[PDB]
């Protein structure tokens, strides 16, 4: 075999009788999940992987763009055109999508437990499809993904380069419980256990020191950007939540008597910037009742400030908004090859 790319196909446990919008897209666009998935380990093979230059990600992105453009029904779409249209509420909950190769190709998988995502990989295996990956589109925090098997893993195309996005892969997930209560209708909030979070964040920080000399590590809020990225942003049950994460990135509470329950303020927005293409989209207001979803914080998107090498510190601010990086955080241990 050798490295090469080819149009992949998808596969999911999705139902034709479901109103839910991922299922509906999956019904006409993917096949059923592999009813007997087989993994054969390749003995004594060493293989080079690069999660940052992987065509799989571009393809998963293309799907999710298509998925969203077909699924979400904004009242008003804006680009110079203003489009006004039917915007009934939809049920929205992502499901696992798998990505598979056609004939003559196979997907290599890296099983080195401490694999960062660029090196060689010494425990390589071949699959026919990936595992099941939820297409969660959030910023700042990665939600509802896989976990790192052993230590916490810092992932970057190059860490000394401040233009490169950083992916933290947690080895212990942490709950985030976001609720809009019944029944001020756009006012909402998330809760995270102070003690777990702050424990996990101190380990992230310990890991960042290993990468950055023994340079003192600090977090700060984002310096700027659109709302989608200055806030932790995500979709629960069709509603677009925007949540202030100032209190999650608190390096005072790295003694003291401080942890408790950390509650982030949120609000549900109707006018958002579209992640797929150009402009804005206005949505209907929130449905009545308890709007809730409990997600697992499983990774963190960071950017590191530039202009700091003549200095004692490194500063890390939560980021993302390049959704492709959300796919990378799950696809990193895969790569397609061609045979002969």
């Amino acid at each position, epitope marked *: 075999w050798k490295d090469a790319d080819t149009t992949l196909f998808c596969a999911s446990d999705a139902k034709a009788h479901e109103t839910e919008v991922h299922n509906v897209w999956a019904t006409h666009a993917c096949v059923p999940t592999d009813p007997n998935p087989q993994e054969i380990h390749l003995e004594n093979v060493t293989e080079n992987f690069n999660m940052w230059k992987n065509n799989m990600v571009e393809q998963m992105q293309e799907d999710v763009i298509s998925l969203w453009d077909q699924s979400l029904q904004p009242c008003v779409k804006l680009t110079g055109s203003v489009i006004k249209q039917a915007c009934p509420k939809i049920s929205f909950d992502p499901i696992p999508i798998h990505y598979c190769t056609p004939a003559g190709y196979v997907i290599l998988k890296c099983n080195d437990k401490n694999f960062n995502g660029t090196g060689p990989c010494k425990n390589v295996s071949s699959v026919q499809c990936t595992h099941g990956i939820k297409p969660v589109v959030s910023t700042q925090l990665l939600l509802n993904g896989s976990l790192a098997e052993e230590e916490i893993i810092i992932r970057s195309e*190059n860490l*000394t*380069n*401040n*233009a490169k996005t950083i992916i933290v892969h947690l080895n212990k997930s942490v709950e985030i419980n976001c609720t809009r209560p019944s029944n001020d209708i756009r006012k909402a909030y998330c809760e995270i256990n102070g003690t777990k979070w702050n424990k996990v964040l101190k380990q992230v920080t310990e890991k960042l020191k290993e990468h950055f000399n023994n340079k003192t590590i600090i977090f700060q809020p*984002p*310096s*700027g*950007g*659109d709302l*989608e*990225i200055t806030m932790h942003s995500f979709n629960c049950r069709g509603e677009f939540f925007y949540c202030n994460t100032t209190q999650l990135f608190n390096n005072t509470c790295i003694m003291k008597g401080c942890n408790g329950t950390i509650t982030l303020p949120c609000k549900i927005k109707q006018i958002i*910037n579209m992640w797929q293409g*150009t*402009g804005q989209a206005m949505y209907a207001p929130p449905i009545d009742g308890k709007i809730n979803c409990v997600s697992n914080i499983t990774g963190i998107l960071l*950017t*590191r*400030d*530039g*202009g*700091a*090498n003549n*200095t004692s510190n490194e*500063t890390f601010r939560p*980021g993302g*908004g*390049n959704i492709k990086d959300n796919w990378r955080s799950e696809l990193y241990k895969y790569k397609v090859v061609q045979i002969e």
Partner: antibody
Amino acid sequence: QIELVQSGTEVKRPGASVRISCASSGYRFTNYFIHWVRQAPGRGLEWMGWMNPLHGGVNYSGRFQGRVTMTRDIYTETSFMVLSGLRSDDSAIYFCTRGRDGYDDGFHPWGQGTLVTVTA
Amino acid sequence: SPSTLYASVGDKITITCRSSQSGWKAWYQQKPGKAPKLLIYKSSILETGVPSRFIGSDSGTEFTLTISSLQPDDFATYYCQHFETFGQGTRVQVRR
């Protein structure tokens, strides 16, 4: 014609802010970072920070920081750099530039530059 | 290294910067009252339109701009780049 065109010469009082524009044409605006870089008669070229036009994300130099805000308008393909609490110190020529991926192949092209002089 | 460098039309010259880390180094030329122009990216790749007399090399922790035959236009200031950080600047001047 891939190009960057900046706004003109500024004379600002000590304490004031400047707003410099940087208009893009000839390429897919959201695909390339914009960097700002100054030439102060004294200190070669100094990077001030980067801005990702996709979503407005920024990375500012600590050496300035607080004082620089970088924003863009996707519809006019124009980027903006506000430097605040100006000092004599900040008298310089200010350049926008296109980071081709955003340091890897870059910086090209550059704006013609914008002179800012800080005087009473 | 260093701020001024003196040479004749037609000489080979080398401009050197040094860095702890890697990777990709770039090189810029600037003339008075003008923006910097990109010469070399990825340590050794010519930007299209730039004369092939401009050569970029990179031996790990030390990287260089060579001008294999100095032309009158080449008397100017040269900046090295490594991510955000720039060299002090080397002014190439007429030797006498």
